[PDB]
Amino acid sequence: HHWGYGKHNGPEHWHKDFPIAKGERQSPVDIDTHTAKYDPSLKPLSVSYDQATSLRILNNGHAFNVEFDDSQDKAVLKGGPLDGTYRLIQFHFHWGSLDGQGSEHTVDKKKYAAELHLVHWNTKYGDFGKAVQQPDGLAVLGIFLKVGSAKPGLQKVVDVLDSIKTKGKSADFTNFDPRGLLPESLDYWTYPGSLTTPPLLECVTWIVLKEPISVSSEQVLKFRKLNFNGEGEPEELMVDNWRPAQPLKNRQIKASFK
Numbered sequence: 001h002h003w004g005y006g007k008h009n010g011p012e013h014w015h016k017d018f019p020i021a022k023g024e025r026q027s028p029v030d031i032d033t034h035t036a037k038y039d040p041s042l043k044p045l046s047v048s049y050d051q052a053t054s055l056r057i058l059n060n061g062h063a064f065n066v067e068f069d070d071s072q073d074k075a076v077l078k079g080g081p082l083d084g085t086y087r088l089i090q091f092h093f094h095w096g097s098l099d100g101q102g103s104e105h106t107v108d109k110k111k112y113a114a115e116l117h118l119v120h121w122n123t124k125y126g127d128f129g130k131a132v133q134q135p136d137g138l139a140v141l142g143i144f145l146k147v148g149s150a151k152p153g154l155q156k157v158v159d160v161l162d163s164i165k166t167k168g169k170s171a172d173f174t175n176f177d178p179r180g181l182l183p184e185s186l187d188y189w190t191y192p193g194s195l196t197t198p199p200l201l202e203c204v205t206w207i208v209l210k211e212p213i214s215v216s217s218e219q220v221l222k223f224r225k226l227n228f229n230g231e232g233e234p235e236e237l238m239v240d241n242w243r244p245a246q247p248l249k250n251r252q253i254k255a256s257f258k
């Protein structure tokens with residue numbers, strides 16, 4: 001009876017195994033654009049992905065992860081609200097059963113069709129497992145997806161999904177360039193928060209881009225053909241793998257822009 005996104009094991013249940021679910025810095029949150037404060041001291045984000053080395057794509061039963069070689073400074077996030085150098089380890093998405101829901105963060109209570117999370121860890125902690133134990137261990141770059149025109153740089157991901165339909169399946173996934181998933185603007189909101197799935201550790205500097213990317217209806221339909229189940233288990237479509245907005249509590253969301 002493991003956590004997931006169903007009626008009996010979904011986000012309202014998680015606090016029983018992971019009491020930090022009701023903590024002081026949980027994610028995601030609603031971004032109230034009128035209460036976010038412009039912070040003129042915030043630096044431009046530095047997204048250095050030209051040497052990224054993708055390795056593999058994995059269906060882990062909760063989402064799919066595109067994994068990177070994080071054994072050297074090859075794809076890093078710096079600047080913005082961050083001190084030091086954060087290495088890209090993986091990206092994944094959260095998405096809905098319908099185009100009207102799927103994002104984890106909301107903007108003035110608006111839900112997007114999906115949300116991309118580019119997960120990075122602080123190199124001063126040596127690897128990911130140590131970084132998630134620290135209040136500044138991770139930086140997650142969040143990008144909203146809206147349904148409209150196709151994102152050409154997403155299609156290589158969409159096309160491999162039939163090879164990782166079920167939980168525990170992986171496939172080689174080399175030479176994927178995550179720059180093809182970024183919007184034009186790097187204007188962002190930032191706040192201190194958590195992992196949005198168990199173990200819900202309070203280790204994340206969230207950086208959420210203001211400008212969504214557009215994907216096609218056909219691209220997101222292919223996300224919704226994935227399965228939460230393993231091969232030879234009853235088929236349960238991998239949809240609505242999002243945690244809803246959590247209380248902001250004693251936090252301020254800062255904006256990089258006016």
Ligand SMILES: Nc1ccccc1NC(=O)c1ccc(NCC(=O)NCCc2ccc(S(N)(=O)=O)cc2)cc1
Pocket residue numbers: 117119129132133140194195196197198199201
């Ligand atoms: N060792 C230790 C000591 C004291 C306190 C905590 C820890 N470690 C842990 O709690 C612990 C660490 C990792 C665990 N599992 C693997 C793991 O990497 N999980 C996190 C992956 C994750 C990555 C990104 C996101 S998201 N949606 O916020 O971008 C969500 C989840 C499970 C438990």
Ligand SMILES: [Zn+2]
Pocket residue numbers: 092093094117196
């Ligand atoms: Zn995520």
